[PDB]
Every structure is written in structure tokens, then in C-alpha cells.
Amino acid sequence: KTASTGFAELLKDRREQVKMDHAALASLLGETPETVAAWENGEGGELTLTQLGRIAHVLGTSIGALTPPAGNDLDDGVIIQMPDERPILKGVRDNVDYYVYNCLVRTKRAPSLVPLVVDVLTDNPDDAKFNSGHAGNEFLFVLEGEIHMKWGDKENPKEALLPTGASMFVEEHVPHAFTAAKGTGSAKLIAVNF
Amino acid sequence: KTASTGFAELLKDRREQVKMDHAALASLLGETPETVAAWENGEGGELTLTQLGRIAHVLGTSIGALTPPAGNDLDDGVIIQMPDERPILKGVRDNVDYYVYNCLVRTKRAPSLVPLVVDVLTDNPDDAKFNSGHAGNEFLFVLEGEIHMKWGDKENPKEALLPTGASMFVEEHVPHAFTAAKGTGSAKLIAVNF
Amino acid sequence: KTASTGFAELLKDRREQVKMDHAALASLLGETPETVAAWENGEGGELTLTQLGRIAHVLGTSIGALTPPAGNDLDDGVIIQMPDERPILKGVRDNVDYYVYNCLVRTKRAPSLVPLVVDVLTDNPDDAKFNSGHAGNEFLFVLEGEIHMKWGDKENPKEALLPTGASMFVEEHVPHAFTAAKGTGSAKLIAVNF
Amino acid sequence: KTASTGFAELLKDRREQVKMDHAALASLLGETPETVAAWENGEGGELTLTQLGRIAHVLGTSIGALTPPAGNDLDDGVIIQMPDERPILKGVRDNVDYYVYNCLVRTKRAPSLVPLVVDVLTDNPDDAKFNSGHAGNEFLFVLEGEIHMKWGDKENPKEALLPTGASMFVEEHVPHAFTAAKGTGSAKLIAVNF
Ligand SMILES: CC[C@H](O)P(=O)(O)O
Ligand SMILES: CC[C@H](O)P(=O)(O)O
Ligand SMILES: CC[C@H](O)P(=O)(O)O
Ligand SMILES: CC[C@H](O)P(=O)(O)O
Ligand SMILES: [Fe+2]
Ligand SMILES: [Fe+2]
Ligand SMILES: [Fe+2]
Ligand SMILES: [Fe+2]
Known part of the structure; x- marks a missing residue:
């Protein structure tokens, strides 16, 4: 309409x-x-x-x-996205290539659904860059490598070293940050905001 | 804002x-x-x-x-309306003065709340004029006189003679119609859509 | 079921x-x-x-x-209550007959809807008894007499003298209290919690 | 509590x-x-x-x-699941090992969130076994191989051959079915119900 x-x-x-x-x-x-x-x-x-x-x-x-x-x-209740039509968006925090967002399928029948394959470029936890938390819960799945996860108070946060295959949930408005495990170069994860 | x-x-x-x-x-x-x-x-x-x-x-x-x-x-969680500032709106169905809507207090913090004091002008049930049902539930209270209520299929509806003080509930999309009891001239009721 | x-x-x-x-x-x-x-x-x-x-x-x-x-x-989307089947419940605050609740129609299809005709027994504002605010918004309509309304901080509240026919809205969790206007004996109002 | x-x-x-x-x-x-x-x-x-x-x-x-x-x-707005603590559940449709559900992290703060890594065992589309659609939308991502997707009327459905990396959305109550691409043995996908 x-x-x-x-x-x-x-x-x-x-x-x-x-x-x-x-x-x-x-x-x-x-x-x-x-x-x-x-x-x-x-x-x-x-x-x-x-x-x-x-x-x-x-x-x-x-x-x-x-x-x-x-x-x-x-299209009869379904919508598909081929891997080559994924919009790419470089993520920059403090003038650095922090993330690389590969956007997956989205639909106007569930606007809050924002699924992403995220390339985690940095691998130095000490230089983790926090977002300030956001609306909507988020589901994560480590696709490749090891992720060093950080959440909570950016001054004194909780941490977790996540192996490939791990899965996590971050409630809305909880500030979080990711980097690849110390020195392992890079990692990749699936992030589904809903 | x-x-x-x-x-x-x-x-x-x-x-x-x-x-x-x-x-x-x-x-x-x-x-x-x-x-x-x-x-x-x-x-x-x-x-x-x-x-x-x-x-x-x-x-x-x-x-x-x-x-x-x-x-x-x-105004600190409250909003008041004096009886003389009520907007009046004549209701017409089939070129007749069917209802008279005296609009009560409304607030942008609950847009669906539409309370009314309704003067029911006609008193001939056989000439009841149906609305086609509407969104939102509605609470009714007979303020004065007797109301002849009609709801459901406008071709073959259910009816109820309601004395002063009666109260009723009409689920959304249920078509209904009111008139004062046969020959009693007029009646008055409070209608709260929420 | x-x-x-x-x-x-x-x-x-x-x-x-x-x-x-x-x-x-x-x-x-x-x-x-x-x-x-x-x-x-x-x-x-x-x-x-x-x-x-x-x-x-x-x-x-x-x-x-x-x-x-x-x-x-x-009963086909409707439910009616005759004035004589209204459950009565004496309201007591500080060992006093503060209110008298005459409960109107209720339905399991809208549990939050609690409509009442309330007899306001006391007429001394200085002795107003506050509730601590409650869940759900509330619509009020003065049925008879004058109401002295109080809301907000029970220590230093806002007030309003409401004539018959006035209508008001109280947002949820806003503490409020009513009595009949000073010395006018008693008053009566319709309270619809939804 | x-x-x-x-x-x-x-x-x-x-x-x-x-x-x-x-x-x-x-x-x-x-x-x-x-x-x-x-x-x-x-x-x-x-x-x-x-x-x-x-x-x-x-x-x-x-x-x-x-x-x-x-x-x-x-745990401060977060909950993590290591890859070895994932509950496994064999899926059987018509006495066949259709799927293998590896359950990912879940939380009582979002009960509708049910993320899964699903091993798609069969690779014969002609033998696709339909579910009857279910409550809640679902996000899919092909983790490995090729998936042959089917949705809609189980008698005359729509189909899609999905390469690794593809992502899709299935609205609630839309019946669907998956198998690995014809003859390719098996495939694997991530399914997030929310
Ligand atoms: C993995 C991506 C993060 O959750 P963002 O919400 O982009 O800061
Ligand atoms: C009393 C007024 C009726 O409920 P309407 O919704 O105007 O047909
Ligand atoms: C008129 C009754 C009041 O609104 P209560 O919610 O009982 O304090
Ligand atoms: C990929 C798993 C399917 O969506 P199910 O809901 O288990 O039939
Ligand atoms: Fe995030
Ligand atoms: Fe109506
Ligand atoms: Fe109240
Ligand atoms: Fe499904």
C-alpha cells in the first residue's frame, strides 16, 4: 500500500x-x-x-x-538472499577497521530482524571498542576462529573467550564489544538482532 | 517533541x-x-x-x-475536562438525528481511549441504525432511561432492553445499534472505547 | 477450555x-x-x-x-450486567467507610477492564486517604455532586475541585485520592480501569 | 522468583x-x-x-x-553456550533420520528465541518431509553445502536451491521443508526461531 x-x-x-x-x-x-x-x-x-x-x-x-x-x-511467506547480493558495510571505531558487516536477508514483515555475518578485523582485546548497547536482543554464533567478548561497564567489563561454534545472547541495552582472540588475527561471527 | x-x-x-x-x-x-x-x-x-x-x-x-x-x-500524569468544554457532535444515520456525542477527556498517552456521553435521540427500535462494528472494545453504561440494544447480524440480531444503571461490553468488530426503549422518547448512556 | x-x-x-x-x-x-x-x-x-x-x-x-x-x-461478543447484580464492596481506609464499590460488567476477554460506580462517602479533603498508585490507566467521570481530587505526592499533592459531569484520566502508578467537596456530604463517580 | x-x-x-x-x-x-x-x-x-x-x-x-x-x-545481561554443551536431538519424519538438531543458547528473558544448527541428513528432494508451519518467524542461514528448500502447499510447493552462505526468512505458519541438494549427500544450516 x-x-x-x-x-x-x-x-x-x-x-x-x-x-x-x-x-x-x-x-x-x-x-x-x-x-x-x-x-x-x-x-x-x-x-x-x-x-x-x-x-x-x-x-x-x-x-x-x-x-x-x-x-x-x-514470496508466499518467504524471502531469499543469495550470498553475492549481501550489502557490505565497513565498520569504523576510532578511525580503525573494526568490523565488516555483511548484511543478510531482511523483511518488512519483521523490521526488527537484522541478521549479519560480521568479520572481526582486530585481534587485540586491550583495544576493544564498545558500542553503547542497543535496542533489541541479539543472538551471536562464532562462525570462525576465536572471539574475545566483552560486555557491561566499559570501564570494568566481564569477558569471555569464545571458541568456534559457541553461541551467545545479549539482552537489549547491554553494551558489548568483540575482537578476535589475542594475536589470532581475525575471527568471524553471525549476529542476529531481533 | x-x-x-x-x-x-x-x-x-x-x-x-x-x-x-x-x-x-x-x-x-x-x-x-x-x-x-x-x-x-x-x-x-x-x-x-x-x-x-x-x-x-x-x-x-x-x-x-x-x-x-x-x-x-x-499534568503530572493527569488530565481533566470540565463539563462545559466537551466537544459536541451531532450523529446522523439515514438523514436522522440518531445520536449526540458529548466527548469526554482524551489523552495522547492512550490514543485508543475515546469516552463519550451519548444522547440517544430516537425511541423506535424498528428503526435502529447499525454501525458496521469497529476496532477496539467498548464499555457502555446506561445513564438515563431505557436503552434497546441490538448487536450481531443486522438482518437477524440479538436484542436487550437495558434499564438505567445497566452496564455492557461489546467486543471489537461486533456491529451494534441503540435506541431508547419503544416510545420512551430518549435515553442517555456513557460509552468508553478503549 | x-x-x-x-x-x-x-x-x-x-x-x-x-x-x-x-x-x-x-x-x-x-x-x-x-x-x-x-x-x-x-x-x-x-x-x-x-x-x-x-x-x-x-x-x-x-x-x-x-x-x-x-x-x-x-454472548456473541457481548456481555450485559443488570443494575441489581452488581457486586458491592465496602472500601475501608484507616478504619473508615471511605468508598463503596459497585462493580460493573467484566469479561475474560479484557481482564484489565474493571469498571466501577464509586460512592465517595467522606467529604473532608483534609482527611483524604491516598492509594499508592496502581497498574493500568483509569478513566473517571463525576456522576453526582462535587469531587475533591488529589494526586501525586501524598505529602504535597495537586488538587482539583470537579463538578458533576467532569471527566478525568489518571496514568498508571500515579497515586490519587478522592472525597466529596468540603462539607457537601457525599459524591459519586464512575471509574473505569483498563 | x-x-x-x-x-x-x-x-x-x-x-x-x-x-x-x-x-x-x-x-x-x-x-x-x-x-x-x-x-x-x-x-x-x-x-x-x-x-x-x-x-x-x-x-x-x-x-x-x-x-x-x-x-x-x-550473567549481567549475557549468557554463553560452549559448543560441547549443546543438547542434541535426532529428528525423525516417516521413520527416517531427517534432521539432527544441535541446540544453541536459550534464555528465559526471550523464551521465543530458539536457535539451532541443523544437520540435514537426506539429499533427495522428492522425499522432502513438510512440517505444518509453526508459530514465530524463522531466520535461516546455509552453513554448509546446498539446501533444497520447499515451502507453501505441500501438494504444489515453491522451491529454491540455496548455496552455502544464502540466508532466508520464513514467516510464521508457512509450512516448509529442507533436504540437501539432489545427491550431494548432506547439508547444514543455522535456524533461528524468534
Ligand atoms: C557483532 C556486532 C555487534 O553486536 P554491533 O551491534 O554492530 O556493535
Ligand atoms: C453509543 C454510540 C455507539 O457505540 P457508535 O460506536 O457510535 O455506533
Ligand atoms: C475511585 C476509586 C479509586 O480510583 P481507587 O483505585 O480504589 O483508589
Ligand atoms: C530447519 C528446521 C525447520 O525449520 P523445523 O521448524 O524444525 O521443521
Ligand atoms: Fe550488537
Ligand atoms: Fe460503538
Ligand atoms: Fe484508582
Ligand atoms: Fe521451521
Whole structure:
């Protein structure tokens, strides 16, 4: 569905549930009832983010509540990604090639799902670079080599030396950091954020 | 919070969780990395609904996921409405004054909460006008008089004669209709959609 | 649905999603595979709360996850309560008849919905008795008289004199207290927790 | 927390939100007010599943609502699993060694997370054995060899030959089946249910 059509149907839904008519709503917004009716007819495409903010406010709700869901990109409930179409993204922390993100399949039917094959470039734990924790839990699996894992307080953290085949879970907002085992050059792991 | 600032922070959050940088994102959108950086700096206010649709799509998520929540209009967790500031809205079904909606307090911290004092104008059950059911459950309480309630199939519905003080619950999407008891003139009830 | 049958189906579901068979599960619990199979066949009725605790633990989940939902008590999506079948419950704070709760309709399809007609017995604000705030938001409507509302810090609270017909919203965990307006004897309000 | 203590605190919470006192609740259950008070004091451990069913019913809610959450087994937000402590479970479909499940790390803070390394034993697509779809989405990654994937209608399904390194997503309730590519002997993949 388009932003316009989704908005058109949801706006009408919301307007009706708070008992307003085109006239009533048009008044609170300083618009004409025809304008409002136009939106409800799919002509809202050029409304600005700020204007959408006002409409949501007047309807005592959020912009998200008035916009359609992510959408559906599945092929009969499935979506596949070949190994050569994986987007690559160099990760840099403190002007260093820390990670290399090879992005796996993603779908608008589960936006929070972000699976990655991560090349861990550095192999000096003492130079581990912490992220500040992030929303969503994360599942990890060591694909190759040994990983030196660090989590918690970046000043005084807990650590773990993980052999190939190990698997771990990091709750959301828990700060963590990885490097390959001391001197082993590099390691590789699968990270699934969900 | 504004639409612009909320968008700016959420866009950055999302861009980072799918591992893209300004360059990567700017490319999929056919924009310049400076443009994207501008959005992330609160300058997205004039983006159109349709453009927001594209950005969401490229980031494999929804517009709602990139926009801030409804907002907070409470006064230390509370919000009050005096009886004279209630918005009134005449309800018309089949060119008739069916209901009269007196809207009670609402808050952006619970958008689905829509409480109403409803004047039931007609008193001829045989002329009951059905709504087609709606999202969200609804709690009813008969404030004055007797209500003749109808729900289910509008062709062959179930009925109930409700005395003052009665209370009922209607699950979402269950079509219903009300009128005052046969010949009793009018009735009044409290309807709380949540 | 029964506790036994719901448990039987959900236990099997969970056992299968963690890839265990009767033997595997029976082992972690110190039971025989036949015992486990019995549970999955509706014979778990006499399992104790503590035993259910162990089963949940071994299956790394909660007891709730292994038990059926509240159930359905609706009559085609609706449930009605006549004014004379309302359960009455005297409310006492500091050995005083503070409130009188007349409980309205409730349903297992929305357990959090607790609507009440509350008789406010005291009319001395200075003797207001605070609750410590509670889970779930609450919608209030003054049915009769004047209410003296208090919320926030019980040591230094905010106040509001509410006329008949006023409506208010109290967010969850916000401590509040009510009495009838100073010297007006008593008042009455509708309180809907959802 | 224990089943007993969690129940004790939640029962009290629920009893209070529906305005009942020990006497009122004890009456609907055919128990003594002291009995009820005992439960609220952690002595409910021996209550049977069926009895818990009644208590939930009387309180118009679910057993889950009266029992504590799964619990917390993390070590400062993290939990690790070494490759040799992975529980193994042979998978059999039609009296054949179809799969071999090597279970990875799991946590009570995300019960729906069930990650597995799956050895795909058969390599004859024509003999693919379908599951009937299951709750929860699933992320797959081909670890070794080639997988012949099948999903949808088991009578007339869609197929995909997946090379090592491919990744896929299967929405919940979509029936699927895997085997190694025709004649290639065996394959191995990572399956993450969340
Ligand atoms: C293995 C990748 C890490 O979890 P990130 O969330 O990118 O810091
Ligand atoms: C009393 C008003 C009815 O519930 P509606 O939802 O407007 O049809
Ligand atoms: C009117 C009753 C109050 O809201 P309580 O939640 O009982 O303190
Ligand atoms: C790869 C394993 C399958 O997805 P299952 O859910 O076990 O049938
Ligand atoms: Fe991470
Ligand atoms: Fe309605
Ligand atoms: Fe309250
Ligand atoms: Fe599966």
C-alpha cells in the first residue's frame, strides 16, 4: 500500500472514532472541509512531516497510528538472499577497521530482524571498542576462529573467550564489544538482532 | 517533541541498525549524503508523505517506526475536562438525528481511549441504525432511561432492553445499534472505547 | 477450555519448539516418559503450582506460556450486567467507610477492564486517604455532586475541585485520592480501569 | 522468583484491582478467608492446575496473569553456550533420520528465541518431509553445502536451491521443508526461531 492510500484510510478511521466530521476536523486544523475530504481520498501525498504532526496532534494520536504498516515483500511467506547480493558495510571505531558487516536477508514483515555475518578485523582485546548497547536482543554464533567478548561497564567489563561454534545472547541495552582472540588475527561471527 | 526532531533521531537509529551510512542510504534514495545528514539534524520537516514512504521502504520498515510517539499532554500524569468544554457532535444515520456525542477527556498517552456521553435521540427500535462494528472494545453504561440494544447480524440480531444503571461490553468488530426503549422518547448512556 | 487441556496442548507445543521428546523432557524433570505423555494427554490437572514452576523452568519459559488464556464468556461478543447484580464492596481506609464499590460488567476477554460506580462517602479533603498508585490507566467521570481530587505526592499533592459531569484520566502508578467537596456530604463517580 | 511467591504477589494484586477482600474471594471459591490469606503469604505451592484454573476464572483473568514471568538466567545481561554443551536431538519424519538438531543458547528473558544448527541428513528432494508451519518467524542461514528448500502447499510447493552462505526468512505458519541438494549427500544450516 502507498503512504497516501494508507493515510487516507487510517485518517478516516481515526476521524470517525473520535466522532469528528470533515467540518469539525477541518476547523481544528485551519483547513477547509474539502481539503480534509481530499486527504481521505488519497490526495495527502504532499503533506509535510510537520503537517502530519499537527493532524496527529489534533486527533490526539501519533503519526504512526495514521500511516500504513511497513508492507509485505514476501514470496508466499518467504524471502531469499543469495550470498553475492549481501550489502557490505565497513565498520569504523576510532578511525580503525573494526568490523565488516555483511548484511543478510531482511523483511518488512519483521523490521526488527537484522541478521549479519560480521568479520572481526582486530585481534587485540586491550583495544576493544564498545558500542553503547542497543535496542533489541541479539543472538551471536562464532562462525570462525576465536572471539574475545566483552560486555557491561566499559570501564570494568566481564569477558569471555569464545571458541568456534559457541553461541551467545545479549539482552537489549547491554553494551558489548568483540575482537578476535589475542594475536589470532581475525575471527568471524553471525549476529542476529531481533 | 516535534515531527522533525523525532524523525531525525529515529531515522539515525534505524539507519544505524541496518548498518548503512549517510552515503549508503543517500544512494538508495537518489539523494546526496549531505541531504540525509540534514534530515538527521532536524531539517526533515518539509518531507512529503510520499517521500517518507520511500525512506521507510528503503529502510525496510514503516513510517510509524521513523516517527515519534503521540506525545504527552498530562499534568503530572493527569488530565481533566470540565463539563462545559466537551466537544459536541451531532450523529446522523439515514438523514436522522440518531445520536449526540458529548466527548469526554482524551489523552495522547492512550490514543485508543475515546469516552463519550451519548444522547440517544430516537425511541423506535424498528428503526435502529447499525454501525458496521469497529476496532477496539467498548464499555457502555446506561445513564438515563431505557436503552434497546441490538448487536450481531443486522438482518437477524440479538436484542436487550437495558434499564438505567445497566452496564455492557461489546467486543471489537461486533456491529451494534441503540435506541431508547419503544416510545420512551430518549435515553442517555456513557460509552468508553478503549 | 480447561486448565488441563490447555496445558496439555501448550506443553506439547513448547516441548516441540525446543526440540525435546518425551524422553528428553522426562529426564530433566526426573519423571518417566509415560508421565510426560500423560500430561500431554490432559492428565496434568493435579500438578502443583511448584511442579508447574519446574516444568516451565526446564522449558526455559513461564507458567503463563504453558497455560491457556482467560477464556471467553461473551454472548456473541457481548456481555450485559443488570443494575441489581452488581457486586458491592465496602472500601475501608484507616478504619473508615471511605468508598463503596459497585462493580460493573467484566469479561475474560479484557481482564484489565474493571469498571466501577464509586460512592465517595467522606467529604473532608483534609482527611483524604491516598492509594499508592496502581497498574493500568483509569478513566473517571463525576456522576453526582462535587469531587475533591488529589494526586501525586501524598505529602504535597495537586488538587482539583470537579463538578458533576467532569471527566478525568489518571496514568498508571500515579497515586490519587478522592472525597466529596468540603462539607457537601457525599459524591459519586464512575471509574473505569483498563 | 518462585511459583509460590510470584503467585502470592500477583493474586493479591488482582484481588485488589477487582475490589474483593479475602472474604469476598474466599466466598466465590468455597474456601475460608484464612486459606486465601495463606496463598497470598506464599503457601499456594500445592494448588493444582485445575484449582488455579478456578481462581483465575473467579478473578476473570488467566492463570498466566497470576503467575510470575519466566525468570532471569543472565550473567549481567549475557549468557554463553560452549559448543560441547549443546543438547542434541535426532529428528525423525516417516521413520527416517531427517534432521539432527544441535541446540544453541536459550534464555528465559526471550523464551521465543530458539536457535539451532541443523544437520540435514537426506539429499533427495522428492522425499522432502513438510512440517505444518509453526508459530514465530524463522531466520535461516546455509552453513554448509546446498539446501533444497520447499515451502507453501505441500501438494504444489515453491522451491529454491540455496548455496552455502544464502540466508532466508520464513514467516510464521508457512509450512516448509529442507533436504540437501539432489545427491550431494548432506547439508547444514543455522535456524533461528524468534
Ligand atoms: C557483532 C556486532 C555487534 O553486536 P554491533 O551491534 O554492530 O556493535
Ligand atoms: C453509543 C454510540 C455507539 O457505540 P457508535 O460506536 O457510535 O455506533
Ligand atoms: C475511585 C476509586 C479509586 O480510583 P481507587 O483505585 O480504589 O483508589
Ligand atoms: C530447519 C528446521 C525447520 O525449520 P523445523 O521448524 O524444525 O521443521
Ligand atoms: Fe550488537
Ligand atoms: Fe460503538
Ligand atoms: Fe484508582
Ligand atoms: Fe521451521
